[PDB]
Coordinates of all heavy atoms in Angstrom, one line a residue:
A231 N 22.9 16.6 54.0 CA 24.0 17.1 54.7 C 23.7 18.6 55.1 O 23.1 19.3 54.4 CB 25.2 17.2 53.7
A232 N 24.2 18.9 56.3 CA 24.1 20.3 56.9 C 25.4 21.0 56.7 O 25.3 22.3 56.7 CB 23.7 20.2 58.3
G233 N 26.5 20.4 56.5 CA 27.8 21.0 56.3 C 28.5 20.4 55.2 O 28.1 20.4 54.0
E234 N 29.7 19.9 55.4 CA 30.6 19.5 54.4 C 30.2 18.2 53.7 O 29.6 17.3 54.3 CB 32.0 19.2 55.0 CG 33.1 19.0 54.0 CD 34.3 18.3 54.6 OE1 34.6 18.5 55.8 OE2 34.9 17.4 53.9
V235 N 30.3 18.2 52.3 CA 30.1 17.0 51.5 C 31.2 17.0 50.5 O 31.4 18.0 49.8 CB 28.7 17.0 50.9 CG1 28.6 15.7 50.0 CG2 27.6 17.0 51.9
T236 N 31.8 15.8 50.3 CA 33.0 15.7 49.4 C 32.7 14.5 48.5 O 32.5 13.4 48.9 CB 34.3 15.5 50.1 OG1 34.5 16.7 51.0 CG2 35.4 15.4 49.2
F237 N 32.8 14.7 47.2 CA 32.7 13.7 46.1 C 34.1 13.4 45.6 O 34.7 14.3 45.0 CB 31.8 14.1 45.0 CG 30.3 14.2 45.5 CD1 29.8 15.4 45.9 CD2 29.5 13.1 45.5 CE1 28.5 15.6 46.3 CE2 28.2 13.2 45.9 CZ 27.7 14.4 46.3
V238 N 34.6 12.2 45.7 CA 35.9 11.8 45.3 C 35.8 10.7 44.3 O 35.0 9.7 44.5 CB 36.8 11.3 46.5 CG1 38.2 11.0 46.0 CG2 36.8 12.4 47.6
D239 N 36.4 10.8 43.1 CA 36.4 9.8 42.1 C 37.4 8.7 42.5 O 38.5 9.0 43.0 CB 36.8 10.4 40.8 CG 35.9 11.5 40.3 OD1 34.7 11.5 40.7 OD2 36.4 12.3 39.5
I240 N 37.0 7.4 42.3 CA 37.8 6.3 42.6 C 37.8 5.4 41.4 O 36.8 5.3 40.6 CB 37.4 5.5 43.8 CG1 35.9 5.2 43.8 CG2 37.7 6.4 45.1 CD1 35.5 4.2 44.8
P241 N 38.9 4.6 41.1 CA 38.9 3.7 39.9 C 38.1 2.5 40.1 O 37.6 2.2 41.2 CB 40.4 3.4 39.8 CG 40.9 3.5 41.2 CD 40.2 4.6 41.8
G242 N 37.9 1.7 39.1 CA 37.2 0.5 39.1 C 35.7 0.7 39.0 O 35.2 1.8 38.5
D243 N 34.9 -0.3 39.4 CA 33.4 -0.2 39.4 C 32.9 -0.6 40.7 O 33.7 -0.8 41.7 CB 32.8 -1.1 38.3 CG 32.9 -2.6 38.5 OD1 32.2 -3.1 39.4 OD2 33.8 -3.2 37.9

Side-chain angles (χ1 to χ4, degrees):
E234 190 200 324
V235 179
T236 302
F237 293 92
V238 183
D239 302 334
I240 52 168
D243 71 77

